[PDB]
């Protein structure tokens, strides 16, 4: 089964992706 | 035979359909007296059903697994009675109608009031022109050769491209 | 009588008469020659 | 540009609620934005493309993560035919206790069952455990981050590509053919030989051991010695149990044909060989154009050289290179057209030539996949024609294309449109007439009077591919044919076993019902094409509006003068053709679903007999199969299909609500909103609050779009609920 | 504000001016036609875009053309 | 109670005679739902001859209405002052049309 | 004509109120039944919406024959109450009872 | 803390908190008179 | 309503083929057809149809014939009127066939 640690790792990677997505969106906005 | 089918005169499902239809009609007929008009009407329906099934049996019609006639329309003459000959009749009739309509419209295009002749038909001219429909293909050929069938593009309006 | 004939010559009256005649002959053909699934007779 | 939307001064100064709506609807039309240059347009599109690819990879990573975390993929792998694959868990505080229990059947917690075919595909490509799926999810999450970074970077001043880079046709085509397609296909072959084939033979090959586990005992010696037949020797036997070593062979490249006997899907060796040959073809193709090394073709020269000497095509293809290069709309139209064809081909080939293990046994998944891909294909085709029309309005230059094929289409648009109209009218008249004749004769209890044309041409095609049922002794159905003697050498035995196997979908048996429904489908295709083609060809102008190009692709009308001009724009042709696309794809999917439901139910004869008249469709397809769907909840309880019952009613409601926008038009609503404004201004304690954007009725075009969106969403949701619920509640 | 253009096919019939509900158009002297006048649209700020002027114009094709553009309170016909 | 009311019969052509339902009473036809039999029985109609006479009178009244329309358009057309007689029209339509109609029907 | 704005604005509001409540009853019920929450529905077996005014009128009409219409021997219509009228084994008319479903449909 | 708690934690954040703040932010952005 | 009223009580109208009620099944279908046909008029506008008619008039002119009564798409108001008339005919006739088949079965 997927461990809690693996889930938390996936969530951290998602957080990174989200900040990069906000950055790209603001950049495209300009 | 063609398409893995069988003749309706050799189809057990076809004959089963005939028997079932006749049986339901006769069950309905059995509720009345023999001389009642409902009984006579039902027995005439029985005769017409039997005549139809027999006519389909004696024909060249093919039958699928369902026991219903299927039509062959790939161009074979052995089944030409199903699409080719009726198609010939339809083309002849429809060409007649269209040719006489076009001829009448073109004839009244030079009348005093062309628009009036479209909503109020000049019946004598119309009947005369309609009687000429039977040679519509020959007339069409002559109109095509004499450059009266097809107009030029320079004479037809178009929109900006 | 000329005016009445011209009224009978109008498009809707003639279409009604012509379609009634055409429907009549189709109906009669099917009354005397019923159930023609192709020209087999 | 001081208020939203900053890309449009005209919209930003509108004082009504319209300003908001239009801003949202014009955000992605970057060509129309204030101060846009061509170079900035290409750069912004490039960055947006990186964003879109990031979204796709996030979606795939999420599917992998939810299956790994909450699915039953290991249980499904251990027992494919008796497990229902899980999509994700449900957590919904609105559920009652009965609902939780109903949605937790076969499990300990409420779940949705997946109908996307992901389990079958992942199983076929070698996935076996939750850990592997989780690793895939993590990789795709990181790749999405990389794509977002790339999108940001290529907007920085030192990394913005120039217009010349975006207009380098030969190099982009070379790389996309040889690298994006050919090398990707080669790498996929490598995956299949190293990973998927061993997995199918009960052998684990992963990142832990792939460097020291050769995919063939003979190694790469045969490949380098040209003794390649060694890779075809010893295929999996007819008794091979998939995922186990019993009956397994060692061939990695084959041309067996047909299906694996147990999975009833394509051989993995056959698919590996397919992708290897594909890789060769595409890598070779990607060397055609001249980039930096002297050799190769120039596309402009190719185009300019192809003019028939007689002159029946006029100037030929001269002018098309600049037209295509300088028009993003024509490029997009070509892309959407080819993608639509490819999506339809995906739908048609996946059901017949099953590529994934056990997929043909998951009936609901089959129906969902076919319907999904056919609807997407319809949307893509409509888009292709819409962007063709946009190209004609915005990008077409008559002088650059003078007397070429593109201009000559415009020159004979009247003949094209009139003949398409004749074809549409002929198909409609005769198909509807035959259906009605059959309906009438069956209603009067005389089914033997039906007109039932046998689809002889298609049956002949099936026979030519080897189908024996129709008694045509032609080509591959003929023992003595040259085609048979040639084909028996490679693939013909397996193909003949599959095609003459009635348990497969390889060339389903057809009859008169198939004939009539196919002519209906042709009607739908021709009418949809007629609307789209007339919209594109009249986009620039018509007799009724000779200067239409000055008004743009989309505009409401030209007023009530000249007899009335509602729905005159090319956008309006797109809008009308959306209805016909939906109707056509509906006919297609109804046909697919009903034929398969009768096959799966063990009674093909019901379709064969009742599909020949409309009442048969209404009664034996829709009415009969509505039953489990409409009983998902009732006065006595609910089951796990209740969500589909609710979605069915939801779709009906959305569709009907779309009718309101489509039928009632703007003036009524604007007058009503005037009284609403009066009421709010005159109501104490509520007039303390005021709008800062004047309420107005939706615009003419906006209402057409909103009605169309409601119609389309309702159509899709209703049919999806029906197909899923009917298939899953029956089987 | 909407755009209203007069093309030189105008015959100075004054019908568009009489049709206008918001007084956008007026007749001005001109030597290009027999009537000695042409239409003009000096007050496009008050044009609602009803296109009654186009409905009234007798030439083929139209001599007055209304192209709808940036919406204002005046062009939206708002009493509020 | 057991016989289904039927007042429309179809001709035997192209198989449509199936529409002549077995409605009872040695009769085949279409089951009609406009309530004619109930109304006729309530009126006291017991024979088809009474129905024939009512139909003949209906034809006579139809011709009379048609002649009256022709007469009051082409031969004797009332002046506008005649039409603007709301008081007299109400008096006649209440007392004569509705009142005498009710009295005679009660008779 | 001089207060058309008031008339139309108030009628518009009445229409929104009626539509939202009357049709939202049905939508609420569909959602509750789908979620496996029958006890949360608007129904006779649940949260009830009894048409008490209609029922009061029905009772009054049922009691009318002897008291407020003393010379009437039976009710004007059996739909208001009374026995079942049977003809040939089929029901001609019997009392038509009004509950929550009748409330919802009358408001529709 | 366990991952099995995440739905009941995350679903209200995704379906209630996030749309409310996103809608408030978009409302504030569309009501702003000078954005650039 | 969708299950216990429409789906359930439509059984008679959809199972009527081959009986005296088959006219009701046919009219049920034809009314559905006319109702759907009305949506073409209700959802579209005459500018499109006039432009299509231009291409068709071209084909007739290309063969040297065309009416002097020039073909025109229906007016805006006539488009609405036709759409609504077919909508009402289709919907009401569908309910008509459905009610009549159901009630003839249950009576
Ligand atoms: C493939 C999807 C896609 C892409 C690549 C784009 C790209 C673009 N959009 Mg579009 N848009 C889209 C979908 C997309 N959009 C959708 C679905 C809508 C709703 C209909 C819109 C509506 C829209 C409007 C109204 C506008 C744009 C604009 C733009 C451009 C400016 C960038 C921007 O908007 O900032 C990106 C947005 C942000 C940075 C804000 C938040 C979004 C980030 C990326 C993710 C959210 C964080 C995450 C959810 C946090 C979770 C928290 C939770 C767990 C608690 C850019 C070209 C603007 C423009 O100027 O056009 C020229 C503009 O005004 N778009
Ligand atoms: C419109 C074309 C049309 C044509 C070609 C015919 C032709 C015919 N009719 Mg028909 N008929 C028609 C319309 C038509 N009818 C119409 C509109 C009606 C009113 C419903 C009838 C009602 C009718 C009756 C009552 C009879 C005929 C009969 C006939 C046959 C008479 C042969 C004869 O004696 O001379 C002939 C085949 C006669 C017949 O068939 O006798 C067996 C006959 O008795 N017809
Ligand atoms: C549009 C497609 C279409 C086609 C090709 C047909 C064709 C046919 N129908 Mg069908 N039908 C249709 C639509 C169609 N119908 C519709 C829309 C309805 C509902 C109104 C029906 C309801 C229907 C019924 C109830 C019946 C038919 C019947 C027939 C057959 C009539 C044979 C006949 O009368 O020939 C002979 C008549 C002619 C050739 C007419 C021309 C006569 C002139 C004088 C010939 C001159 C030539 C020189 C024929 C196969 C009948 C049948 O027998 O089926 C097997 C039948 O009973 N149709
Ligand atoms: C070999 C190196 C290489 C590679 C791997 C790529 C890859 C890519 N580039 Mg390209 N690019 C390259 C070189 C390369 N490029 C060069 C040298 C230039 C400058 C000349 C460009 C200029 C460029 C631009 C301007 C853009 C790209 C974009 C892209 C992306 C396209 C979208 C996508 O992801 O679909 C990948 C799809 C697949 C892997 C599957 C394709 C299958 C399709 C459906 C065809 C299937 C047909 C089938 C095989 C057979 C026909 C069917 C028939 C039987 C009916 C993709 C990542 C776009 C992008 O989105 O960037 C962010 C973009 O806008 N590139
Ligand atoms: C078309 C080419 C192709 C495709 C689509 C696949 C697809 C797959 N392979 Mg296969 N494979 C291939 C070719 C391919 N392979 C080739 C040529 C070989 C050598 C013969 C293999 C050998 C192989 C082995 C041994 C295994 C696989 C496995 C897999 C599966 C899981 C892979 C995975 O973990 O995804 C996640 C994605 C990746 C791992 C790659 C992306 C990694 C990103 C980019 C990392 C980001 C780097 C960056 C520095 C990060 C920091 C920066 C950032 C945070 C900003 C997946 C189905 C595995 C499996 O489970 O099979 C069932 C497995 O064990 N493959
Ligand atoms: C089921 C409803 C329905 C039907 C039957 C039609 C039918 C048609 N559409 Mg329409 N359409 C519809 C819905 C429908 N549409 C909707 C909802 C929209 C979105 C607004 C459209 C938008 C649309 C566009 C944009 C176009 C069409 C076109 C067409 C024609 C296509 C060619 C054809 O099949 O000719 C065959 C004719 C028919 C099938 C209709 C005739 C029906 C019967 C058989 C005729 C019977 C006549 C009867 C005997 C006489 C009356 C009896 C009595 C009253 C006197 C056809 C008339 C196209 C066109 O004009 O092509 C030429 C076209 O460009 N439609
Ligand atoms: C298209 C219009 C139309 C059609 C085709 C029908 C068809 C029918 N009506 Mg209906 N009817 C209509 C409009 C129509 N109605 C309207 C607008 C009203 C309101 C006044 C009625 C009130 C009505 C009554 C009360 C009855 C019918 C009945 C019938 C059926 C028997 C026909 C008959 O001859 O009975 C003849 C009618 C009677 C024998 C009873 C008439 C009693 C009324 C009160 C007479 C009123 C006349 C009066 C002068 C009108 C002026 C009103 C005044 C305020 C100015 C038949 C189905 C009868 C039925 O259902 O039988 C089974 C029936 O009893 N109709
Ligand atoms: C089923 C499709 C449908 C629906 C839902 C509507 C709905 C409406 N129509 Mg429309 N109409 C329709 C078909 C439909 N119509 C069609 C096909 C036409 C063409 C003839 C029209 C032409 C038309 C006209 C001419 C008029 C209307 C008007 C109305 C409104 C009536 C007032 C009202 O009750 O609001 C209440 C809202 C509803 C009844 C809809 C659902 C209510 C829900 C179930 C309860 C409340 C939920 C709440 C908002 C929470 C939402 C949660 C969400 C945020 C997630 C209402 C919004 C009228 C109007 O605006 O009057 C003020 C009006 O004059 N319509
Ligand atoms: C884009 C694909 C995608 C989709 C549609 C979903 C959908 C869902 N997730 Mg999942 N999730 C995903 C990817 C996705 N997830 C990935 C890659 C991870 C690993 C980080 C997770 C980790 C995760 C957890 C731990 C949980 C969910 C849960 C859920 C459910 C409730 C929403 C929620 O609260 O999640 C919260 C989601 C996050 C905190 C991380 C989101 C990460 C993805 C990549 C965001 C995607 C952004 C998207 C592409 C933007 C475009 C959409 C927009 C234009 C419309 C819902 C079914 C909950 C659940 O299962 O309830 C039963 C839950 O507890 N997800
Ligand atoms: C289809 C359609 C048309 C095209 C339909 C037209 C022009 C009607 C054609 C009617 C025919 C020509 C009259 C009846 C004739 C028969 C159909 C064929 C007999 C031919 C001759 C005997 C006259 C519109 O003009 C239109 C206008 C505004 C909103 C919606 C629509 C709309 O939906
Ligand atoms: S569009 Fe209307 S308001 Fe504008 S100039 Fe013409 S008539 Fe006047
Ligand atoms: S623009 Fe047209 S209507 Fe106005 S004056 Fe000129 S010709 Fe007359």
Checking chain A for breaks where C and the next N are over 2.5 Å apart, the residues before them are none
Distances in Å between the alpha carbon of G96 and those of G44, G48, G78, I80?
Answer: 16, 18, 8, 41
Could you count the other beta carbons within 10 Å of the beta carbon of residue B89?
Answer: 11
Residue D340: CB partners within 8 Å, gap ≥ 6? D377, D378, D380, D381, D383, D384
> Nearest Cα to B58, choosing from G25, F56, C40, D80?
C40
Q: Which single residue is written with the structure tokens 């739905």?
A: H7
What Rg, from alpha-carbon coordinates, does chain D have? Answer: 29
Tell me the C-alpha distance between D611 and D618, whole Å: 10
Cβ(F32)–Cβ(F6) under 8 Å?
yes
With beta carbons under 8 A apart, name residues in chain G contacting F24. none
I49 is in an annotated binding site: yes
Enter the tokens of residue D373. Answer: 């891909």
Helix D38-70 and helix A4-29, axial crossing angle in degrees, nearest 10: 170
Tell me the C-alpha distance between B19 and D47, whole Å: 74
Check whether the bond before D5 is cis (ω within 30° of 0): yes
> Nearest Cα to D428, choosing from D330, D528, D361, D573?
D528
> Which residues sit opposite E26 in a β-bridge?
E40
Ligand sitting nearest the alpha carbon of B133: 3
Written in H, E and C, the secondary structure of chain G is CCCHHHHHHHHHHHHHHHHHHHHHHHHHHHHHHHCCCHHHCECCCCECCCCHHHHHHHHHHHHHHHCCCCCCCCCCCHHHCCCCEEECCEEEECCCCCCHHHHHHHHC
Cα torsion D36, D41, D44, D48: sign: positive
Enter the tokens of residue F54. Answer: 């009512």
HSE-up of residue D53 (Cα within 13 Å, Cβ side): 16
Residue D344: CB partners within 8 Å, gap ≥ 6? D373, D374, D377
Cβ(D677)–Cβ(E80) under 8 Å?
yes
Exposed/middle/buried for residue D293 (C-beta within 10 Å: 0-12, 13-18, 19+):
exposed
Distances in Å between the alpha carbon of B151 and those of G51, I46, I62, I67?
Answer: 76, 29, 5, 16
Cβ(E32)–Cβ(E9) under 8 Å?
no
Does residue C18 have its Cβ closer than 6 Å to ligand 2? no
Enter the tokens of residue E23. Answer: 């007084």
Q: What are phi and psi of D669, to 5 degrees?
A: -65, -40
> Which residues sit opposite E65 in a β-bridge?
E5
Helix (H, G, I), strand (E, B) or coil at D204: coil
Residue nearest to atom 5 of ligand 6 (CA): I37
Could you count the other beta carbons within 10 Å of the beta carbon of residue B106?
Answer: 14
Cβ(D2)–Cβ(H34) under 8 Å?
yes
> Which residues sit opposite B21 in a β-bridge?
none
D159-163: which pairs have CB atoms within 8 A and are 24 or more residues apart?
Answer: D160/D39, D160/D43, D161/D42, D161/D43, D161/D46, D162/D39, D163/D38, D163/D39, D163/D42
Tell me the C-alpha distance between G60 and G67, whole Å: 10
Q: What are phi and psi of E70, to 5 degrees?
A: -70, 125
Enter the tokens of residue G94. Answer: 């019997």
Enter the tokens of residue H27. Answer: 């409302």
Could you count the other beta carbons within 10 Å of the beta carbon of residue G24?
Answer: 12
Exposed/middle/buried for residue C40 (C-beta within 10 Å: 0-12, 13-18, 19+):
middle
Could you count the other beta carbons within 10 Å of the beta carbon of residue B29?
Answer: 18
β-pair type (G85-87, G90-93):
antiparallel
Calculate ∠ Cα D574-E70-D327, nearest 5°: 45
Indicate the DSSP class of residue D404.
Answer: B
Q: Which single residue is written with the structure tokens 């999450």?
A: D141
First to last CA, chain E: 18
Indicate the DSSP class of residue F17.
Answer: G
* Inter-chain CB proximity D540 and B160 less than 8 Å: yes
Cβ(D160)–Cβ(D50) under 8 Å?
no
Helix D570-600 and helix D700-730, axial crossing angle in degrees, nearest 10: 10
Tell me the C-alpha distance between D420 and D585, whole Å: 19
DSSP letters, D431-485, are HHHHHHHHHHHHHTT-GGG---B--HHHHHHHHHTT--TT----GGG-TT-HHHH
Cβ(D395)–Cβ(D327) under 8 Å?
yes
Tell me the C-alpha distance between D620 and G60, whole Å: 50
Does residue C30 have its Cβ closer than 6 Å to ligand 3? yes
D595: left (phi over 0), alpha (psi -120 to 50) or beta: alpha
Tell me the C-alpha distance between G12 and G42, whole Å: 26
Is there an interface between D and F (3+ Cβ pairs < 8 A)?
A: yes
Q: Which uninterrupted H or E stretch holds E6?
A: strand E3-6
Tell me the C-alpha distance between D591 and D373, whole Å: 15
Q: Searching chain F, which residue's CA lies closest to the CA of residue B49?
A: F15
Distance from the CA of D55 to the center of ligand 1, in angstroms? 11
Helix (H, G, I), strand (E, B) or coil at E13: coil
* Inter-chain CB proximity D20 and H30 less than 8 Å: yes
> In D79-162, which residue ranges form alpha helices assigned H by DSSP?
97-103, 118-124, 130-153
Ligand sitting nearest the alpha carbon of D335: 4
Question: If interface means Cβ-Cβ distance under 8 Å, which residues of chain C face chain F?
Answer: 27, 30-31, 34
Tell me the C-alpha distance between D347 and D117, whole Å: 13
Ligand sitting nearest the alpha carbon of E15: 12
HSE-up of residue F33 (Cα within 13 Å, Cβ side): 10
What Rg, from alpha-carbon coordinates, does chain H have? Answer: 15
Cβ(D66)–Cβ(D178) under 8 Å?
no
Calculate ∠ Cα D483-D484-D485, nearest 5°: 95
Could you count the other beta carbons within 10 Å of the beta carbon of residue F26?
Answer: 12
Tell me the C-alpha distance between I47 and D657, whole Å: 25
* Inter-chain CB proximity H2 and A4 less than 8 Å: yes
Measured between CB atoms, which of I54, I61, I67 is closest to B159?
A: I54
Residue nearest to atom 6 of ligand 9 (CA): D62
Distances in Å between the alpha carbon of C40 and those of B61, D260, D273, D578?
Answer: 9, 50, 56, 45
> In B1-114, which residue ranges form alpha helices assigned H by DSSP?
12-29, 37-58, 84-108
Residue F88: CB partners within 8 Å, gap ≥ 6? none
Enter the tokens of residue F27. Answer: 């009769």
Distances in Å between the alpha carbon of D226 and those of B39, D271, D275, D283?
Answer: 87, 21, 19, 20
Distances in Å between the alpha carbon of D650 and those of B151, D283, G38, H3?
Answer: 56, 49, 19, 34
> Which residues sit opposite F6 in a β-bridge?
F31
Indicate the DSSP class of residue B153.
Answer: G
Q: Does F1 touch chain G (CB under 8 A)?
A: yes
Residue nearest to atom 7 of ligand 6 (CA): I37
What Rg, from alpha-carbon coordinates, does chain B have? Answer: 26
Cβ(D704)–Cβ(D659) under 8 Å?
no
- Give CA torsion, residues D671, D673, D678, D684, to 10 deg: 160
HSE-up of residue G102 (Cα within 13 Å, Cβ side): 10
Helix (H, G, I), strand (E, B) or coil at D402: coil
Tell me the C-alpha distance between D490 and D467, whole Å: 18
Cβ(B13)–Cβ(B66) under 8 Å?
yes
Tell me the C-alpha distance between D471 and G90, whole Å: 60
Tell me the C-alpha distance between D185 and D456, whole Å: 39
Check whether the bond before F77 is cis (ω within 30° of 0): no
Helix (H, G, I), strand (E, B) or coil at D153: helix
Distance from the CA of I12 to the center of ligand 7, in angstroms? 29
Distance from the CA of D207 to the center of ligand 5, in angstroms? 9
Sheet holding B62-63, edge to edge: B6-7, B62-63, B69-70
Tally the residues of chain G: 108
Indicate the DSSP class of residue I64.
Answer: T
Q: Which single residue is written with the structure tokens 């990789």?
A: D139
> In D353-446, which residue ranges form alpha helices assigned H by DSSP?
363-394, 405-411, 413-443
**Other chains touching E, judged by 3 or more CB pairs under 8 Å:** D
Enter the tokens of residue H7. Answer: 């739905």
Q: Which single residue is written with the structure tokens 């009311």?
A: F5
How far away is chain D from the Cα of H1, in angstroms, using its nearest Cα? 17
Residue D338: CB partners within 8 Å, gap ≥ 6? none
Distance from the CA of D82 to the center of ligand 4, in angstroms? 40
Indicate the DSSP class of residue H5.
Answer: G
No. of H helices and E strands in chain D? Answer: 31, 4
Could you count the other beta carbons within 10 Å of the beta carbon of residue D41?
Answer: 16
DSSP letters, A1-30, are ---HHHHHHHHHHHHHHHHHHHHHHHHHH-
F95-101: which pairs have CB atoms within 8 A and are 24 or more residues apart?
Answer: none
């Amino acid at each position: 089964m997927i461990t809690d640690f693996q889930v938390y790792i996936a969530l951290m990677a998602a957080l990174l992706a989200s900040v990069l997505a906000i950055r790209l969106g603001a950049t495209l906005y300009q | 035979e063609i398409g893995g089918l069988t003749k309706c005169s050799e189809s057990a499902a076809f004959t089963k359909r005939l028997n079932a239809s006749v049986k339901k009609l006769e069950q309905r007929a059995s509720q009345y007296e023999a001389d009642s008009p409902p009984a006579l009407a039902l027995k005439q329906q029985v005769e017409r059903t039997q005549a139809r099934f027999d006519k389909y049996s004696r024909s060249e019609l093919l039958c699928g697994a369902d026991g219903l006639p299927h039509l062959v329309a790939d161009g074979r003459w052995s089944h030409a009675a199903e699409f080719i000959l009726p198609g010939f009749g339809f083309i002849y009739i429809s060409g007649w109608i269209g040719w006489v309509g076009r001829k009448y419209l073109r004839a009244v295009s030079t009348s005093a009031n062309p628009s009036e002749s479209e909503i109020i038909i000049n019946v004598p001219l119309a009947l005369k022109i309609m009687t000429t429909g039977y040679i519509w293909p020959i007339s069409a050929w002559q109109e095509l050769i004499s450059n009266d069938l097809v107009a030029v593009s320079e004479e037809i309006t178009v929109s900006p491209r | 009588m000329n005016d009445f004939q011209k009224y009978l010559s109008t498009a809707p009256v003639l279409l009604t008469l012509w379609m009634t005649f055409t429907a009549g002959f189709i109906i009669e053909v099917n009354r005397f020659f019923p159930d023609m699934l192709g020209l087999y007779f | 540009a001081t208020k939203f939307p900053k890309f449009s001064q005209a919209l930003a100064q509108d004082p009504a609620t319209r300003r908001i709506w239009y801003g949202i609807a014009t955000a992605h039309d970057l060509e129309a934005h204030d101060g846009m240059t061509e170079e900035n347009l290409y750069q912004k599109i490039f960055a947006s493309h990186f964003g879109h690819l990031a979204i796709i990879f996030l979606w795939t990573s999420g599917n992998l993560f939810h299956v790994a975390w909450q699915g039953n993929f290991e249980k499904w792998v251990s027992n494919p035919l008796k497990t229902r694959p899980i999509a994700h868990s449900i957590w919904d505080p609105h559920f009652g206790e009965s609902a939780l229990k109903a949605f937790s059947k076969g499990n300990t917690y409420p779940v949705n069952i997946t109908f996307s075919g992901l389990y079958q595909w992942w199983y076929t490509i070698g996935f076996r455990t939750n850990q592997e799926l989780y690793k895939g999810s993590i990789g795709l999450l990181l790749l999405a981050s990389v794509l977002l970074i790339a999108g940001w970077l290529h907007l920085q001043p030192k990394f913005r590509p120039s217009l010349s880079w975006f207009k380098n046709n030969e190099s982009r085509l070379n790389h996309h053919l040889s690298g994006l397609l050919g090398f990707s296909s080669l790498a996929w072959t490598g995956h299949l030989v190293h990973v998927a084939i061993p997995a199918s033979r009960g052998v684990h090959v992963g990142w832990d051991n792939f460097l020291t586990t050769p995919p063939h005992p003979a190694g790469l010696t045969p490949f380098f010695t040209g003794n390649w037949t060694v890779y075809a020797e010893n295929p999996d036997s007819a008794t091979h149990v998939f995922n186990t070593s019993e009956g397994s062979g060692t061939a990695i490249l084959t041309f067996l044909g047909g299906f694996h006997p147990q999975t009833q899907s394509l051989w993995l060796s056959d698919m590996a060989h397919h992708h290897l040959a594909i890789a060769v073809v595409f890598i070779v193709a990607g060397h055609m154009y001249r980039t930096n090394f002297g050799i190769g073709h120039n596309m402009k020269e190719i185009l300019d050289a192809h003019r028939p000497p007689g002159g029946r095509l006029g100037a030929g293809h001269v002018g098309l290179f600049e037209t295509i290069t300088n028009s993003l709309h024509m490029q997009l139209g070509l892309a959407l057209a080819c993608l639509g064809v490819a999506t339809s081909l995906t739908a048609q080939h996946m059901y017949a030539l099953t590529p994934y293990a056990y997929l043909s046994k998951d009936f609901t998944t089959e129906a969902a996949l076919y319907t999904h891909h056919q609807y997407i294909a319809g949307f893509l085709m409509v888009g292709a024609f819409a962007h063709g029309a946009i190209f004609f309005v915005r990008d077409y230059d008559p002088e650059l294309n003078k007397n070429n094929v593109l201009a000559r289409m415009l020159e004979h648009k009247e003949a094209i449109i009139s003949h398409l109209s004749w074809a549409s009218l002929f198909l409609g008249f005769h198909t509807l007439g035959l259906y009605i004749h059959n309906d009438t004769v069956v209603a009067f209890g005389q089914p033997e009077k039906q007109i039932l044309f046998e689809p002889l041409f298609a049956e002949y095609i099936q026979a030519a591919s080897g189908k024996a049922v129709y008694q045509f002794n032609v080509l591959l159905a003929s023992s003595t044919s040259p085609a048979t003697a040639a084909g028996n050498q490679v693939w013909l035995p397996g193909w003949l076993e599959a095609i003459n196997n009635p348990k497969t979908d390889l060339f389903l048996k057809i009859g008169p019902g198939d004939f009539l429904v196919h002519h209906a489908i042709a009607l739908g295709l021709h009418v949809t094409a007629l609307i789209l083609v007339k919209g594109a060809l009249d986009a620039r102008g018509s007799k009724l509006m000779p200067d239409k190009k000055d008004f743009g692709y989309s505009f409401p009308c030209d007023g009530p003068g000249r007899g009335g001009t509602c729905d005159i724009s090319a956008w309006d042709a797109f809008y009308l053709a959306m209805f016909w696309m939906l109707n056509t794809i509906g006919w297609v999917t109804f046909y697919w679903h009903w034929k398969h439901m009768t096959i799966w139910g063990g009674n093909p004869g019901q379709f064969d007999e009742s599909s020949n008249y409309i009442m048969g469709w209404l009664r034996d397809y829709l009415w009969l199969n509505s039953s489990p769907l409409i009983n998902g909840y009732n006065p006595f309880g609910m089951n796990n299909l209740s969500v589909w019952s609710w979605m069915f009613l939801f779709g009906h409601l959305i569709w009907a609500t779309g009718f309101m926008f489509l039928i009632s038009w703007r003036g009524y609503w604007q007058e009503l909103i005037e009284t609403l404004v009066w009421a709010h201004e005159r109501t104490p304690l509520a007039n303390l609050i005021r709008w800062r954007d004047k309420p107005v009725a939706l615009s003419i075009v906006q209402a057409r779009l909103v009605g169309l969106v409601h119609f389309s969403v309702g159509y899709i949701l209703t049919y999806a609920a029906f197909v899923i619920a009917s298939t899953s509640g029956k089987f | 504000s909407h755009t209203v253009k007069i093309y030189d096919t105008c015959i100075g019939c004054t019908q568009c001016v009489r049709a206008c509900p918001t007084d956008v158009l007026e007749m001005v002297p001109w030597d290009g036609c027999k009537s000695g006048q042409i239409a003009s649209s000096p007050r496009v700020e008050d044009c609602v875009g009803c296109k009654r002027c186009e409905t009234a114009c007798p030439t083929d094709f139209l001599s007055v053309r209304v192209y709808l553009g940036a919406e204002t309170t005046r062009s939206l016909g708002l009493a509020y | 109670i057991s016989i289904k009311q039927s007042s429309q019969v179809v001709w035997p052509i192209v198989g449509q005679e199936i529409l002549n339902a077995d409605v009872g009473g040695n009769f085949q036809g279409i089951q009609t739902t406009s309530g004619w039999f109930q109304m006729w029985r309530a009126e006291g109609i017991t024979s088809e001859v009474e129905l024939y006479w009512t139909a003949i009178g209906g034809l006579a009244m139809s011709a009379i209405m048609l002649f009256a329309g022709w007469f009051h358009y082409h031969k004797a057309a009332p002046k506008l002052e005649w039409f603007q007689n709301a008081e007299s029209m109400m008096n006649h339509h209440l007392a004569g049309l509705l009142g005498l109609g009710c009295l005679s029907w009660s008779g | 004509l001089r207060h058309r704005d008031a008339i139309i604005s108030h009628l518009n509001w009445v229409c929104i109120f009626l539509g939202c409540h009357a049709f939202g009853f049905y939508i609420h019920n569909d959602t509750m039944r789908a979620l496996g929450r029958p006890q949360d529905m608007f129904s006779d077996k649940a949260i009830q919406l009894q048409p008490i005014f209609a029922q009061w009128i029905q009772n009054i009409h049922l009691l009318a024959p002897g008291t407020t219409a003393p010379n009437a021997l039976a009710t004007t219509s059996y739909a208001f109450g009374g026995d079942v009228i049977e003809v040939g084994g089929k029901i001609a008319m019997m009392p038509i009872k009004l509950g929550t479903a009748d409330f919802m449909v009358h408001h529709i | 803390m366990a991952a099995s708690f995440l739905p009941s934690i995350l679903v209200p954040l995704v379906g209630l908190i996030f749309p409310a703040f996103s809608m408030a932010l978009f409302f504030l952005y569309v009501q702003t008179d000078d954005i650039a | 309503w969708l299950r216990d009223f429409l789906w359930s009580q439509a059984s008679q109208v959809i199972q009527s083929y081959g009986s005296a009620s088959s006219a009701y099944g046919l009219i049920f279908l034809g009314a559905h057809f006319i109702w759907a046909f009305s949506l073409m008029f209700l959802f579209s506008g005459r500018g499109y149809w006039q432009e299509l008619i231009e291409s068709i008039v071209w084909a007739h002119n290309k063969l040297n014939f065309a009416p002097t009564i020039q073909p025109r798409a229906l007016s805006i108001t006539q488009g609405r009127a036709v759409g609504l008339a077919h909508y009402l005919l289709g919907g009401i006739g569908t309910t008509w066939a459905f009610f009549l088949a159901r009630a003839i079965s249950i009576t």
